[PDB]
Design an enzyme around this catalytic site. Structure first.
Site, PDB file in Angstrom:
ATOM      1  N   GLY G  29       0.790  -1.232   0.000  1.00 22.86           N
ATOM      2  CA  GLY G  29       0.000   0.000   0.000  1.00 22.86           C
ATOM      3  C   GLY G  29       0.819   1.278   0.000  1.00 22.86           C
ATOM      4  O   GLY G  29       2.048   1.243   0.070  1.00 22.86           O
ATOM      5  N   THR G  30       0.126   2.413  -0.070  1.00 23.35           N
ATOM      6  CA  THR G  30       0.776   3.726  -0.115  1.00 23.35           C
ATOM      7  C   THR G  30       1.340   4.099   1.253  1.00 23.35           C
ATOM      8  O   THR G  30       0.953   3.524   2.271  1.00 23.35           O
ATOM      9  CB  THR G  30      -0.188   4.844  -0.577  1.00 23.35           C
ATOM     10  OG1 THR G  30      -1.233   5.018   0.387  1.00 23.35           O
ATOM     11  CG2 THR G  30      -0.795   4.524  -1.941  1.00 23.35           C
ATOM     12  N   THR G  31       2.250   5.067   1.268  1.00 29.18           N
ATOM     13  CA  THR G  31       2.926   5.472   2.499  1.00 29.18           C
ATOM     14  C   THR G  31       2.019   6.356   3.357  1.00 29.18           C
ATOM     15  O   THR G  31       1.352   7.254   2.847  1.00 29.18           O
ATOM     16  CB  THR G  31       4.242   6.227   2.205  1.00 29.18           C
ATOM     17  OG1 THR G  31       5.015   5.502   1.238  1.00 29.18           O
ATOM     18  CG2 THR G  31       5.067   6.401   3.480  1.00 29.18           C
ATOM     19  N   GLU G  46       0.151   9.537   1.632  1.00 29.28           N
ATOM     20  CA  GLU G  46       0.400   9.616   0.194  1.00 29.28           C
ATOM     21  C   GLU G  46      -0.806   9.061  -0.567  1.00 29.28           C
ATOM     22  O   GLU G  46      -1.182   7.903  -0.376  1.00 29.28           O
ATOM     23  CB  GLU G  46       1.657   8.806  -0.150  1.00 29.28           C
ATOM     24  CG  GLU G  46       1.947   8.626  -1.635  1.00 29.28           C
ATOM     25  CD  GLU G  46       3.098   7.669  -1.892  1.00 29.28           C
ATOM     26  OE1 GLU G  46       4.034   8.045  -2.628  1.00 29.28           O
ATOM     27  OE2 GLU G  46       3.076   6.539  -1.358  1.00 29.28           O
ATOM     28  N   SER G  74      -2.458   2.106   5.835  1.00 27.56           N
ATOM     29  CA  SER G  74      -1.898   1.674   4.559  1.00 27.56           C
ATOM     30  C   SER G  74      -2.254   0.215   4.317  1.00 27.56           C
ATOM     31  O   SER G  74      -2.230  -0.590   5.245  1.00 27.56           O
ATOM     32  CB  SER G  74      -0.378   1.836   4.568  1.00 27.56           C
ATOM     33  OG  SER G  74      -0.012   3.196   4.723  1.00 27.56           O
TER      34      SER G  74
END
Ligand SMILES: [Cl-]
Ligand SMILES: [Mg+2]
Ligand SMILES: [Mg+2]
Ligand SMILES: [Mg+2]
Ligand SMILES: [Mg+2]
Lengths: 231, 250, 111, 241, 244, 240, 243, 235, 204
Positions: G29-31, G46, G74
């Site tokens: 997943g995204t940060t 993010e 995330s």
């Protein structure tokens, strides 16, 4: 492979295969397009038939006077989810005398789909939905995936060959967003967008299905000779 | 959630064997030796206190348990399984008998209730059998003294004397030679200590051996006076000192 | 003791013509000898060219109308935007009322 | 080979899921120790904060179950907290129903019975933790009772738990072999804590700073944990003799 | 989920057999032989205890023959623990019937219901069947003396003479040979013991390896008496018939 | 509760559990049904592997559901008791609520519905039983004969057989039974039913059971001697 | 083998492989990050711009619980939403009975126990999210991070997702260079920088920055989103640092 | 083993696809919709000559204005018919009117996907639901176990379906009379059937606005068969 | 209206020397109307005797219930139930219906087969045990029976003397009660013989 028998099982790389297979059912489904301006929001759907004697499967469902969606994948699953939306829209009206926000409608669909991806015995929904609506913060377009992911967009498309229509809308972004106070021109842009996903077949009178909602426009569906204007 | 194991985990194999019961009996075989001997005027049950660590206080762990004032129990196999069975056995003695008839159940019927609990763990959904064999000694007015064995299957048999666990085959042979129908309780305790010494490796004393009897009524252990018909419990656990005294005349 | 019912007064009148129909009702709402409102609407447009008024206990009247309007909405969803005929609406309302046979809507209804 | 996935018997009469739960116990790589004084029961445990981003005050494997009972856990923190919450609920319910504070050994038995159920019922997994309960009981005095994933429990004169339990166990065994008594003959709990730390240092062969240790103390009518500064004072006294 | 570990106890084989019922019958074939013989003036129930010990307390022991009520008894072959569950259900049952109709339960009605309970475990619930075969010996005023058998399938049938458990093939042949319709109880007692003596896997048939019972109208005037034989009484009847 | 789906579709569109239930019926003893002009006869095989049997008390193969309807079967014996009990309860429930006894078609439809329900319910297996249901409707003189099977399908038959070696006796009935002129009398109907079983049974002694059902709740079971007379006459005519 | 096919099964190691596979979904997943400041906490995330067709500032990822707790996560977004819905129920019942708003440590355990419960049975799947959350209570500021196993600790700074290593390194510098502490407005600026620096691991697609904060002085101990000028000021500070 | 509600890698429900194979094994059923009415016809397919063919009920009345033909595991259809009849009559109770053919079909199809681990498996039967209402006139629907229903001008289901559907492709036009449609069903049934078509092994039915749903007598069908033979021999 | 006095009836039990006696009237009525003169209120389960007064449907129901329970007791225990044990079973069974009770007045009588000790006991409708040495009374003429028993009774009476005492207590109490009479029965019980005598009394 060994991790696709049920929805309750992660794969070694952290993937949920039953959800990914449900996502695959959407890609097999017929193309449908969604797009909006600041005043109106439009759904355009290519209906599919079994053969020449058969009717063309309906793609668009009305949820309330100010909200509705188009489907792609398992139609019965769309009937279940749209029925849920109808009830939620209706709960908001009866209890709070309040039209349900489109963003909140997406949050409810996300949460309903999610429960089916974490529990044993059940299965994910096998359908993708494009929800349009006009509420207190103007026009809206949502994309629903049965993984649970819901996304608010200016425009989009789902189904078979949907990448063509999605690229067109990505180019036309600056043009069609400005089409305010002109429903016919916004539909034209939608019909031109869905045309980028066609091969062999073309848009006929009983093939095309269009729906619109806006500022002073209740959610209405157009089929038959009512869409001959846009062919 | 929900318990979704509503199906049997013990099933018949093609040969007719109930695998989980057999495997439970194997767990009992690995367990520490325990035995029981019936005399004319009493019953004795005994076992080794196999201490897991010398820092552990082995007095706090009771392998021999009182079920009713006139019924006691000892086991071989898995200790935790035994502990919960004792809790259930004590409770069922009240709910299915004492609260109805106003008196404690006879040995055979309490054994029957314990056996039922163990049988159900052999057929009910989402459970394994109990990994223990019980030896239940007791007394009641109309049946006198009695000694029963209860297996993981739920089957139970009355014994004059027997042994279960690690060295049961050798111990049962030893008891066959020594047992007769004219034994006094003190003679049975003596034979129990002799039989148990053969299966014990290390220290053999009152602190490493657990031994109890079903014998005469103990009015000193009743806790109150004034009712002639209430004469006290027949179950008594022998102390560390009382065991050592009988090991000198061994 | 708690009395779940009340009387909000009011009177309604329906007359049927040859090619038209009227449903009239006063706008006064009351309890005992007090006036609550001099203008509180009591006759409603329920959709599909049907007008309705539930007179008596206002809380039960408002609930019934609210439920019938809802019944019309779901009749469209379930039967392809078909128009609810007046005779079909009447039969539907019977079932709304009798669903509380043992704790009635304290209203006299006219459509 | 599904007899290794759920809690049913193997052909050898073994429960592999229970045995593997014992192995999860050492996953944290922390060693704990418990000893008894005259008036008190002391429990110490290694504290390891590897990440600098962690708030070290929130990193703990010692729990205050009731006013009188303390619990140290050897195993992963999620299972540890699961057990802690349950023990707290049980201790509170006991007091409400029976009108007196739940004894340390009774709570241990109750938690051990719950652990037994997980070894018998298939849908529930064992908790990968060893629970060491400590108190100064009003009837039995200073008390140490330890529970494991098998559902086994027993009282202790002293005890140790973790990867290097054997080294600590033998060290304690040798001390009680000399003194020939079941406890640390000492008046103040401060000196009993000093004994506990000293004998862990000797057994493990490592020196400790104030942030390397975590201490719990049980006295009559209250159990409490020591702060870093309370431990520092304890470490100073050890070094000065 | 849990589906992975389900043995599916209530399914058909490709040949149309119930796996667990067949395997339960295989279990029962290793159990001690039990024999029932019906005569004109009574019924005999004989059964063999499995490899006993000298230290087993026989006079207080019961693994084969059980009493359901004053008129009806059963001989067991299979898992004793399973049998006791069913026996207690049957006992409660005979009492329910007696409370409702104020008459002793007809033998067949009692048999049918135990057999219906067994049937249920083969069709639904996902549980293993009861590894038990019964021989019912009873009397009522409709059909008189009756012998029935039931097995884990829940199927039951009536008999003049029948065996269950081990060596039933050999035992049934011997019974079919020497049985006659005008036979009496004393003769039936002799037949039952002679059959066991020839079919037994043991070296010799002794009193300590047997359970025995009769249901006789040999009670003072028009009534029925159940006799569960004591160890000494089994020893005497073994000498009388000339086996020991 | 145990919810497992035991009866399910396979890649080739078959429900194996239902098909394996038919194999249990194939194993069962032969049963035959023949309807005459003014009667119906139900014949049943009794396997002679079981002697020393008490024929007084042994469950009979033909069961009365009501005073005017009977039910015979082939397959698992224990399973048949459950269907028969349900059918008997429904028969009394119908009389109790509608004040008329069940028609043979109604009773068959109920039993068939029960069988079907056990092919798409969780945690249960299909009945390993096929039934022949026969009788006369109240105030009617037209004979009725129906068949059911584990899948739940049912149908009416002029004559039909089920169970082991049913293929052979059906072959016999197909060439011997004439629709334009069915067995006019009881004798002719019973004779044809016995003849058909004699193609399969082995010995004509205690292996054949016959039950005649006539209009207006007139049901009777033939004895050994009465049947033996039919067996004698058939073979004496055959020696030619 | 086969120990990784079912949840709540111990391997011979003593590990629950299904939970470890859930962590892989989190790492995919995204940060997202969290920073503990002098009198509160700051959360940042993010958001990958998959397409131009995404409406800016509409697909909000950070979620509020009660009025004083912020949650970001995330991994599988729906799983995070499910966890927050439960968090809101837990917070509501606590306030209903005890009157006071739920303390952060109390709230942290409520999520922890719920997530841990989904590692006890094979009838459920573990959560595919690591959740960073916290806020201000009577005892001050608290920041927590919660893993799929149900494990959680208190943090000075926290990070999870595909760019967690890069983020963690940046957080470690702030802890060293500011022992006396960091202000709320500083933490917002630093949060923006760290997300921008962590974006090098997701550098294919461009992204949208989203920040929220709870601070005793700046927001009266209530959770609020960073909007308008204060957001743009943080973006400018972040863009200046990467160049 | 594997879940009952499991998706295949192609995005289809295994059990639904397998039930469709069972329907292919079923006896042929044909429906043709015209402006004068809708005709429904079926192959009876008796397994033996002793089986009284008139008891084979593969065409069924749901209401006076709605009929139904079936193909596949016909035992599974009984509970669907029961639900349909209840739905039709219940709507008449609540709304004092006939129920729309589409609404009735939708109600039946709502049962289809109510299976899991509710019933244990999908239905193994397809239905041709024919009827008439005031709004949309004469209609013919094809209800599958997937929960999907398509409206058709003409449709064939069962073992000879693809051969029959190709024939219906050429023969159907919007100006068909009822008599022409009757003969057309008989023609196509005779083409795909194994045994020779007659009044005993095939059954006709229709639904008109005036007379409602009617199953044809064997005497009436016999004349239509004789009329067919003569008109085919005419050229 | 009062359930305990609709049907009417009485029971009395007495101890003697190595013996007990229990007696009852035979009337069953519907208030003023006499319906049966053969309604015996004394039952026995092995050697334990139980007399029950009060509402006749509950009398009949409890008899069938204790017959049920004692038959199962015997099958499992392999022996007949004793009076002391049975008394506890009656109390248990009545109290389990604490808030919907059987409207009865039971009386237990018997001799312990082992100790040989005579035993009697009485209960209220919800299980409270009255274990008396001398006598127990129950029914619509309980006040009358108390007066007769308390004056006529003396301890350690022989069976044939005890018979006369209990019979005269019953008869004269019944003749001062409108809802009792229409016949009477007396059981004389010894350790291994029991005699049952029907008394001659006025039939009004
Ligand atoms: Cl407990
Ligand atoms: Mg067991
Ligand atoms: Mg387990
Ligand atoms: Mg009088
Ligand atoms: Mg009078």
């Amino acid at each position: 492979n060994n991790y696709d028998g049920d929805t309750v099982t992660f794969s070694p790389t952290g993937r949920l295969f039953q959800v990914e297979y449900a996502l695959e059912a959407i890609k097999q489904g017929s193309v449908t397009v969604g797009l909006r301006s600041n005043t109106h929001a439009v759904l355009v759907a290519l209906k599919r038939n079994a053969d020449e004697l058969s009717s063309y499967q309906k793609k668009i469902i009305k949820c309330d006077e100010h909200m509705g969606l188009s489907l792609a994948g398992l139609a019965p699953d769309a009937r279940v989810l749209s029925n849920y939306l109808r009830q939620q829209c209706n709960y908001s009206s009866l209890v709070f005398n309040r039209k349900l926000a489109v963003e909140r409608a997406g949050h409810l669909l996300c949460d309903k789909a999610q429960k089916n991806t974490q529990s044993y015995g059940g299965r994910p929904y096998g359908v993708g939905l494009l929800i349009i609506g006009y509420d207190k913060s103007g026009a809206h377009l949502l994309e629903f995936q049965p993984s649970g992911n819901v996304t608010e967009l200016y425009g989009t498309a789902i189904g078979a060959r949907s990448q063509g229509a999605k690229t067109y809308l990505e180019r036309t972004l600056d043009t069609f967003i400005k089409i305010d106070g002109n429903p016919d021109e916004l539909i034209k842009a939608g019909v031109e967008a869905i045309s980028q996903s066609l091969r062999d077949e073309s848009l006929t009178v009983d093939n095309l299905s269009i729906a619109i909602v806006g500022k002073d426009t209740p959610f209405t569906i157009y089929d038959g000779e009512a869409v001959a204007k846009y062919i | 959630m929900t318990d979704r194991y509503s199906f049997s985990l013990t099933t018949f194999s093609p040969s007719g064997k109930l695998g989980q019961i057999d495997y439970a009996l194997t767990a009992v075989k690995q367990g520490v030796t325990s035995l029981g001997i019936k005399a004319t005027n009493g019953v004795v049950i005994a076992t080794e206190k196999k201490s897991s660590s010398p820092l552990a206080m082995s007095e706090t762990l009771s392998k021999v348990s009182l079920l009713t004032p006139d019924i006691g129990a000892v086991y071989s196999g898995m200790g935790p399984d035994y502990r919960v069975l004792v809790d259930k056995s004590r409770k069922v003695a009240h709910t299915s008998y004492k609260r109805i008839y106003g008196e404690y159940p006879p040995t055979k019927l309490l054994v029957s209730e314990v056996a039922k609990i163990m049988q159900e763990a052999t057929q009910s959904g989402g459970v394994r059998p109990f990994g223990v064999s019980l030896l239940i000694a007791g007394h009641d007015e109309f049946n006198g003294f009695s000694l029963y064995q209860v297996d993981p299957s739920g089957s139970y048999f009355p014994w004059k004397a027997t042994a279960i666990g690690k060295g049961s085959v050798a111990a049962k042979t030893f008891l066959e030679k020594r047992w007769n129908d004219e034994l006094e309780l003190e003679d049975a305790i003596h034979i129990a200590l002799l039989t148990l010494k053969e299966s014990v490796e290390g220290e053999f004393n009152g602190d490493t051996i657990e031994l109890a009897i079903i014998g005469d009524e103990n009015p000193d252990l009743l806790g109150y006076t004034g009712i002639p018909t209430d004469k006290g419990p027949r179950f008594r656990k022998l102390t560390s000192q009382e065991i050592n005294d009988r090991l000198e005349a061994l | 003791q708690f009395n779940p019912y009340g009387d909000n007064g009011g009177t309604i009148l329906g007359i049927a013509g040859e090619d038209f129909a009227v449903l009239a009702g006063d706008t006064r709402n009351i309890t005992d000898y007090s006036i609550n409102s001099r203008y509180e609407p009591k006759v409603f447009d329920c959709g599909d060219n049907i007008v309705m008024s539930a007179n008596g206990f206002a809380a039960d009247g408002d609930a019934l109308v609210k439920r019938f309007k809802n019944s019309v909405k779901w009749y469209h969803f379930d039967h392809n935007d078909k128009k609810l005929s007046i005779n079909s609406a009447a039969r539907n309302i019977q079932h709304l009322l009798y669903s509380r046979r043992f704790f009635p809507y304290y209203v006299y209804n006219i459509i | 080979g599904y007899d290794r996935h759920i809690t049913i018997f193997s052909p050898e009469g073994r429960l592999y899921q229970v045995e593997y739960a014992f192995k999860a116990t050492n996953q944290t790589n922390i060693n704990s120790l418990a000893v008894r004084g005259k008036d008190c029961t002391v429990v110490i445990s290694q504290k390891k904060v590897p990440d600098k981003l962690l708030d070290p005050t929130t990193v703990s494997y010692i729990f205050c179950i009731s006013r009188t009972i303390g619990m140290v856990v050897n195993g992963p923190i999620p299972d540890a907290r699961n057990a802690a919450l349950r023990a707290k609920a049980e201790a509170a319910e006991f007091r409400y129903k029976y009108g007196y504070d739940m004894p340390c050994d009774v709570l241990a038995k109750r938690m051990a019975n719950l652990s037994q159920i997980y070894t018998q019922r298939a849908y529930m997994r064992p908790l990968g933790v060893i629970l060491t309960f400590v108190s100064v009981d009003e009837e039995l005095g200073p008390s140490i009772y330890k529970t494991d994933p098998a559902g086994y429990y027993v009282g202790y004169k002293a005890t140790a738990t973790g990867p290097k339990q054997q080294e600590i166990t033998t060290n304690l065994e040798n001390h009680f072999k000399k003194s020939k008594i079941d406890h640390i003959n000492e008046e103040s709990w401060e000196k009993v804590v000093e004994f506990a730390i000293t004998h862990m240092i000797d057994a493990l062969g490592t020196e400790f700073s104030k942030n390397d240790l975590e201490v719990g103390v049980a006295t009559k009518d209250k159990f409490f944990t020591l702060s870093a500064e309370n431990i520092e004072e304890r470490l100073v006294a050890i070094a000065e003799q | 989920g849990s589906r992975r570990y389900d043995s599916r106890t209530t399914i058909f084989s490709p040949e149309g057999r119930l796996y667990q019922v067949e395997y339960a019958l295989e279990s029962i074939s290793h159990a001690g032989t039990a024999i029932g013989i019906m005569a004109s003036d009574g019924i005999v129930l004989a059964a063999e205890r499995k490899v006993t010990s000298t230290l087993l307390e026989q006079d207080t022991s019961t693994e084969k023959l059980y009493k359901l009520n004053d008129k009806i008894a059963v001989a067991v072959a299979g898992l004793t623990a399973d049998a006791e569950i069913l026996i207690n259900t049957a006992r409660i049952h005979a009492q329910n019937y007696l409370k409702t109709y104020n008459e002793d339960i007809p033998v067949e009605i009692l048999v049918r219901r135990l057999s219906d309970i067994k049937q249920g475990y083969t069709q639904h619930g996902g549980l293993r069947p009861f590894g038990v075969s019964f021989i019912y010996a009873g009397y009522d005023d409709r059909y008189g003396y009756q012998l029935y058998t039931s097995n884990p399938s829940g199927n039951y049938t009536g008999w003049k003479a029948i065996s269950v458990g081990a060596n039933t093939s050999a035992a049934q042949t011997l019974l079919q040979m020497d049985y006659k319709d005008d036979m009496k109880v004393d003769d039936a007692i002799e037949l039952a013991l002679k059959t066991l003596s020839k079919t037994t896997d043991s070296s010799a048939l002794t009193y300590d390896r047997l359970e025995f019972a009769t249901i006789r109208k040999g009670a003072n005037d028009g009534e029925v008496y159940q006799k569960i034989f004591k160890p000494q009484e089994i020893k005497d009847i073994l000498v009388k018939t000339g086996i020991t | 509760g145990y919810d497992r789906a035991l009866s399910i579709f396979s890649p080739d569109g078959h429900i194996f559990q239902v098909e394996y239930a038919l194999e249990a019926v194939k194993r069962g003893t032969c049963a035959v049904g023949v309807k005459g002009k003014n009667c119906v006869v139900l014949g049943c095989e009794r396997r002679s592997t079981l002697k020393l049997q008490d024929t007084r008390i042994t469950p009979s193969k033909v069961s009365k559901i009501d005073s005017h309807v009977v039910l015979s079967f082939s397959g698992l014996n224990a399973d048949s008791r459950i269907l028969i009990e349900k059918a008997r309860v429904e028969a009394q429930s119908h009389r109790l609520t509608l004040e008329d006894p069940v028609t043979v078609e109604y009773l068959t439809r109920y039993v068939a519905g029960v069988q079907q329900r056990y092919t798409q319910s969780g945690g249960v297996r299909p009945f390993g039983v096929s039934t022949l249901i026969a009788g006369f409707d109240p105030r009617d003189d037209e004979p009725k004969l129906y068949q059911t099977e584990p899948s739940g399908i049912y149908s009416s038959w002029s004559a039909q057989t089920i169970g082991r070696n049913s293929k052979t006796v059906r072959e016999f009935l197909e060439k011997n039974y004439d629709r334009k002129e069915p067995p006019a009398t009881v004798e002719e109907c019973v004779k044809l039913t016995v003849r058909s079983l004699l193609e399969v049974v082995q010995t004509g002694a205690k292996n054949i059971e016959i039950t005649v059902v006539k209009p207006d709740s007139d049901i009777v079971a033939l004895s050994s001697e009465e049947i033996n007379q039919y067996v004698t006459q058939i073979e004496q005519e055959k020696q030619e | 083998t086969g120990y990784d096919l079912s949840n709540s099964v111990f391997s011979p190691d003593g590990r629950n492989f299904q939970v470890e596979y859930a962590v892989k979904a989190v790492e995919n997943g995204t940060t997202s990050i969290g920073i503990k400041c002098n009198d509160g906490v700051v959360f940042a995330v993010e958001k990958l711009i998959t397409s131009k067709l995404l409406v800016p500032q509409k697909n909000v990822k950070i979620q509020v619980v009660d009025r004083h707790i912020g949650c970001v996560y995330s991994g599988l977004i729906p799983d995070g939403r499910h966890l927050v819905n439960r968090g809101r129920e837990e917070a509501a019942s606590f306030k209903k009975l005890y009157k006071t708003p739920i303390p952060i440590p109390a709230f942290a355990d409520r999520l922890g126990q719920y997530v841990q419960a989904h590692t006890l049975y094979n009838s459920v799947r573990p959560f595919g999210v690591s959740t960073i959350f916290g806020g201000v209570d009577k005892n001050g500021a608290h920041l927590y991070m919660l893993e799929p196993s149900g494990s959680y600790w208190g943090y000075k700074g926290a990070a999870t997702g595909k760019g967690r290593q890069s983020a963690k390194a940046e957080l470690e510098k702030l802890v060293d260079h500011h022992p006396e502490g960091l202000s709320a407005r500083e933490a917002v600026k630093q949060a923006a920088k760290i997300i921008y620096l962590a974006h090098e691991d997701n550098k294919e697609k461009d992204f949208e920055l989203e920040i929220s904060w709870c601070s005793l002085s700046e927001t009266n101990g209530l959770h609020k989103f960073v909007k308008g000028d204060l957001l743009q000021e943080a973006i400018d500070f972040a863009q200046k640092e990467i160049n | 083993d594997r879940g009952v509600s499991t998706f295949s890698p192609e995005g289809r429900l295994f059990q639904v696809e397998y039930s469709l194979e069972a329907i292919k094994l079923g006896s042929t059923a044909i429906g043709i919709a015209t402006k004068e009415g809708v005709v429904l016809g079926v192959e009876k397919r008796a397994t033996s000559p002793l089986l009284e063919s008139d008891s084979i009920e593969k065409i069924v009345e749901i209401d006076r204005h709605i009929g139904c033909a079936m193909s596949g595991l016909t035992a599974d259809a009984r509970s669907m018919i029961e639900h349909a009849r209840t739905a039709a009559v219940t709507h008449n109770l609540y709304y004092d009117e006939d129920i729309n053919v589409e609404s009735l079909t939708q109600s039946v199809c709502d049962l289809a996907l109510r299976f899991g681990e509710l019933m244990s498996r999908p239905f193994g039967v397809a239905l041709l639901i024919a009827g008439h209402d005031a709004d949309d006139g004469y209609q013919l629907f094809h209800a599958e176990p997937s929960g999907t229903f398509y409206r058709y001008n003409a449709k064939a289901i069962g073992s000879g379906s693809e051969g029959a559907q190709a024939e219906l492709l050429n023969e159907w036009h919007s100006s068909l009379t009822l008599k022409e449609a009757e003969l057309l069903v008989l023609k196509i049934l005779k083409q795909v059937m194994e045994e020779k078509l007659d009044e005993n092994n095939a059954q006709l039915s229709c639904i008109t606005k005036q007379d409602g749903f009617k199953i044809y007598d064997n005497e009436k069908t016999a004349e239509l068969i004789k009329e067919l033979k003569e008109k085919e021999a005419a050229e | 209206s009062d359930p305990s006095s609709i049907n009417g009836g009485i029971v009395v039990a007495m101890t003697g020397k190595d013996c007990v006696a229990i007696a009852c009237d035979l009337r069953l009525g519907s208030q003023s109307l006499g319906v049966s003169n053969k309604f015996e209120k004394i039952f026995h389960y092995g050697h334990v005797f139980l007399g029950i007064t009060g509402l006749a449907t509950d009398v009949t129901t409890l008899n069938e219930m204790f017959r049920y329970k004692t038959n199962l007791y015997k099958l499992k225990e392999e022996r007949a139930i004793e009076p002391e044990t049975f008394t506890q079973l009656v109390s248990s069974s009545l109290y389990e219906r604490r808030f919907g009770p059987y409207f009865v007045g039971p009386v237990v009588a018997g001799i312990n087969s082992k100790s040989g000790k005579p035993f009697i006991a009485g209960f209220d409708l919800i299980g409270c045990i009255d274990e008396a040495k001398d006598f127990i009374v129950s029914g619509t003429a309980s006040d009358q029976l108390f007066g007769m028993c308390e004056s006529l009774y003396e301890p350690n009476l022989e069976p044939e003397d005890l018979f006369e005492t209990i019979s005269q207590a019953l008869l004269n109490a019944a003749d001062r009660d409108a809802l009792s009479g229409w016949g009477a029965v007396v059981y004389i019980i010894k350790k291994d013989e029991v005699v049952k005598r029907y008394l001659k009394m006025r039939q009004d």
